[PDB]
Structures are given as structure tokens and as C-alpha cells.
Amino acid sequence: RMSMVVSGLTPEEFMLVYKFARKHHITLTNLITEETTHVVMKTDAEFVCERTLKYFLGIAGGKWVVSYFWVTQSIKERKMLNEHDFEVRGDVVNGRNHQGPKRARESQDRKIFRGLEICCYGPFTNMPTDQLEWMVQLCGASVVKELSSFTLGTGVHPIVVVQPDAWTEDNGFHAIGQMCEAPVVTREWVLDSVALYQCQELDTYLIPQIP
Amino acid sequence: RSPVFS
Secondary structure, eight states: OOEEEEESOOHHHHHHHHHHHHHHTOEEOSSOOTTOOEEEEOBOTTSEEOOBHHHHHHHHTTOEEEETHHHHHHHHTTSOOOGGGGBOOEETTTBTTOOHHHHHHTOTTSOTTTTEEEEEOSOOSSSOHHHHHHHHHHTTOEEEOSGGGOOOSTTOEEEEEEOGGGSOSSOGGGSSTTTOSSOEEEHHHHHHHHHTTSOOOSGGGBOOOOO | OOOBOO
16 A cells, blocks of 8 residues: 655645645655655755755655645645656756656665665765665665675676775774775766666765875 | 755
């Protein structure tokens, strides 16, 4: 059955969603899970939203990712309208019409990080490491928790992901490369790929490593 | 309240 979560809404507007979910007996939860089917996002008129964690995780889990307007229009027409008419089209970072949410729904058989091992390394802010890890895992990557734990082999593609400005004023995220054999990329590599549901090239996200 | 990622 349907199971909704909401993102980017004023607890006012959350009020309307709660009233609507109560009216229709639709599961509404405050935390997104494997079972969530709909992530209801605040959008402008063209169904373009901001990127919140729930946004990424809705895309990563191939969920319906849908504008708040699906709820308000549905109330207005007293009928469960069609998600397709309200699917989020893009976000204010990666493009107003990149259609990630659709691609992710359509690509569960060819997940963008299939074949990758990813280590989410060093401090992060605003997104618990294990949610970043869940996000890559959803997208098909196998999750590695310590550098010394990358599986070796030429069939393995390791990647280290870091958020440089969560680090202490010391530039130690350039010395990760002497500790393992992988490319080292910013967290925006993940976030952009996930949003676009397309694996981006590392190139513009690589962090140079001291030898 | 929910963090945004720009």
C-alpha cells in the first residue's frame, strides 16, 4: 500500500498532508524507510525542488518523488490524482528538468553504483554517515567502512568519498591516497550522480592526493 | 529545519 513522507514543507503545510492522509487512510510517517512509496516535496510551479536528504533517498530507492501539489490538487479535486502528473522534474542544483526521479524509477535493473565499493570517510555535516552509506547502497554500491577494508582485485572499483569542508583546518584529506589505492572524490560526486540518477565522471570531483 | 544541499 501507499506510504508517504514529506520534505521541505512548513508544519503548516504538513498539516494539510496529515489531514489528507487521515481522510484517505494513507500511511504517513515522519521518517523515510524501505517501505516508503511517496516522497512529497515542496516544489515551485514547474515541479522543481530543493535537495534534502529525503529527496536523495527517495530517488535512490526509486520511489515516487512527487510535488506537494499532488496533495493540494488532490484535495481540491477530492480524488487521488496521478503521480505522473506531479512527478518532480528537477532540482535547483542539477537542472530544472533532468528527470532523475523518473530515471531512478526506471533503472532498478541497472543501478548507477553497481560494481563500485564506496568508503564514506572522515567527518560529514548535516547528513549522518550511515544515511550517505544507505544512499550509495540503494544505488547498488557495496559499502566499505574502513580504508584498510577495500576488497582488492582488478574487478573491484574502490572510491573514497569525503566532504572537505567538514574537515579541521588541517588538509589531511590529501593524505588519504597513501593509505589506499582508490580515487578520492567530494560528496557532491555522490549527490549529483544520485540526483541525476546518472553516475557522473569523477574528474571534476577528484581531490588531488599527496604522494 | 531539514538541511538543504546546494
